[PDB]
Design an enzyme around this catalytic site. Structure first.
Site, short mmCIF file in Angstrom:
data_model
loop_
_atom_site.label_atom_id
_atom_site.label_comp_id
_atom_site.label_asym_id
_atom_site.label_seq_id
_atom_site.Cartn_x
_atom_site.Cartn_y
_atom_site.Cartn_z
N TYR A 17 -10.62 4.85 3.58
CA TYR A 17 -9.55 5.03 2.61
C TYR A 17 -9.51 6.47 2.11
O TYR A 17 -10.49 7.23 2.26
CB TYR A 17 -9.72 4.05 1.43
CG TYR A 17 -9.54 2.61 1.80
CD1 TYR A 17 -8.31 1.97 1.64
CD2 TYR A 17 -10.60 1.86 2.35
CE1 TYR A 17 -8.15 0.64 1.99
CE2 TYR A 17 -10.44 0.53 2.70
CZ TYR A 17 -9.21 -0.08 2.51
OH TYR A 17 -9.07 -1.41 2.86
N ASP A 77 0.80 -1.24 0.00
CA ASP A 77 0.00 0.00 0.00
C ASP A 77 0.84 1.31 0.00
O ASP A 77 0.30 2.38 -0.27
CB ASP A 77 -0.99 0.00 1.17
CG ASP A 77 -2.25 -0.87 0.89
OD1 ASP A 77 -2.21 -1.74 0.00
OD2 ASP A 77 -3.27 -0.66 1.57
#
Ligand SMILES: NC(=O)c1ccc[n+]([C@@H]2O[C@H](COP(=O)(O)O)[C@@H](O)[C@H]2O)c1
Ligand SMILES: [Cl-]
EC number: 2.7.1.22
Length: 188
Positions: free
Chosen positions: A133, A40
């Protein structure tokens, strides 16, 4: 035979929100000379992300990721690993963790061990909705993008060329840590 160039590399993949990052961290604090790289950290900026026919941001595909940057980071760790043990075998450990590791062909021969965290559809959706997110999940993003892209990944892994240990992500953190630790110490 000179020492210092050997490494032990562990891949921890799995569906989103399956406890991958927490497993990596728990393993690291029980393993000597151990680093963690997180997939990520190599996502492209939102400005470079494509959008599909129905307007969903395309994040759950390898195109969303700077995998050349991630390789360079793996290479940086290897160079540092070479100098981590003073000369006088203690083999340095790297944990690479992320949702899309085992369909990336340049890394197909890097894995000394491989674990894959799984949780079913409803529990994955539920967990995903508790997390924020950036950018945030659009309405219907789980069904429209996240889950179909996950299923695509699982089909891509049907012809994988090395062994994967599949794990029940509904187990507790400690349960998962102990299971993997118990397997890992035997491989090391
Ligand atoms: N890290 C980022 O910049 C970013 C941005 C938007 C969505 N995501 C999501 O991250 C997920 C993968 O990360 P996790 O395995 O931690 O859930 C993907 O399913 C993707 O939809 C990440
Ligand atoms: Cl790339």
């Amino acid at each position: 035979v000179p020492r210092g160039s050997k490494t032990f590399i562990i891949g921890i993949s799995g569906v989103t929100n399956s406890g991958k990052t927490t497993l990596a961290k728990n393993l690291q604090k029980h393993l000597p000379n151990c680093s963690v790289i997180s997939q990520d950290d190599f996502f492209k900026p939102e400005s470079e992300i494509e959008t599909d026919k129905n307007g969903f941001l395309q994040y759950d595909v390898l195109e969303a990721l700077n995998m050349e940057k991630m390789m360079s980071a793996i290479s940086c760790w290897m160079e540092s690993a070479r100098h981590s043990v003073v000369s006088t075998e203690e083999i340095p450990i790297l944990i690479i963790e992320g949702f899309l590791l085992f369909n990336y062909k340049p890394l197909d021969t890097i894995w000394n061990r491989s674990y894959f965290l799984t949780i079913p559809y409803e529990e994955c959706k539920r967990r995903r909705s508790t997390r924020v997110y950036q950018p945030p999940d659009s309405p219907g993003y789980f069904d429209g993008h996240v889950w179909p892209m996950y299923l695509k990944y699982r089909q891509e892994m049907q012809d994988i060329t090395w062994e994967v240990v599949y794990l029940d992500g509904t187990k507790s953190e400690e349960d998962l840590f102990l299971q993997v630790y118990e397997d890992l110490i035997q491989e090391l």
